[PDB]
Design a protein around this ligand. Sequence first.
Ligand SMILES: Cc1ncc(COP(=O)(O)O)c(C=O)c1O
Ligand SMILES: CC(=O)OC[C@H](N)C(=O)O
Lengths: 309, 4
Amino acid sequence: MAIYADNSYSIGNTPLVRLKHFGHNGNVVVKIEGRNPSYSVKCRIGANMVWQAEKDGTLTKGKEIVDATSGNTGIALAYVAAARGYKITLTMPETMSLERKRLLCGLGVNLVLTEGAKGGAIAKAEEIVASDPSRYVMLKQFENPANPQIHRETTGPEIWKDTDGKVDVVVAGVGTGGSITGISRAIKLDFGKQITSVAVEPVESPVISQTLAGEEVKPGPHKIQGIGAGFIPKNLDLSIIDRVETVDSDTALATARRLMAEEGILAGISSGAAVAAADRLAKLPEFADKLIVVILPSASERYLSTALF
Amino acid sequence: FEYG
Ligand SMILES: Cc1ncc(COP(=O)(O)O)c(C=O)c1O
Ligand SMILES: CC(=O)OC[C@H](N)C(=O)O
């Protein structure tokens, strides 16, 4: 029967909701990844990175997990570690919301946080696994192929299924790049439909836009938690990206607030950025009758400590 | 927020 053996197996099957105050006559639909265990899209890769490491034998009983996170991946790995019986240590920038810090400790993580100015998180972590290489396993979400793979296997197929194959555009903020990569691979390659894959990054740190334009790559600070890593991650397949949209922090925050107040959707800051980007495309006659699906990575209550509220 |  439909009873999951632990909480890691209950990932996904998140709903699509049509927006009423964005887009043009309902052409913008949002995928609410806040409806997940640990309540972000990252639960998917928290699960699959652990499952994969188990299956190639890098993760065994007694081995301790390590990775670097801006929060949600950390919370995701923590619920999976707790559910499946692993010890776990994580690194994070000091500047991430208190909520992230708060429940990571409740989930029983040995927590380790780094200089906010350095973003830095990736650095010490590696320095930590070196301490006893067969004690610790680093899962490395920015380059681990188990990250986009679970999106190719679940998130993309769900989108295809729930839109009855009518999806024309996928809009997703880029952090690790796993979401837009896996989803795009599923729909374009597995189901065969030539959609428009749209990456979203902060205008303050538009390193994807700069790279593709062959300009000076200049990362910068921003408030859009979860995206804008300030470099091109290995798990972002540039070859499958058709378009890059930049969004500023203010507009991202205002849009998240609008999602709450006008749509009754409890979205996080990066969800506001993705919808703002989607709304701009949706109001181009060229997309005015395409079906645009927007990933909403996380939920509101994870950001009560931030500018969102 | 920056690198990571
Ligand atoms: C809140 C939030 N938004 C957006 C993203 C970007 O998702 P991805 O890493 O698949 O690019 C993340 C990544 O964890 C996130 O935590
Ligand atoms: C790019 C970023 O901000 O972090 C990666 C991912 N959001 C995490 O949960 O760690």
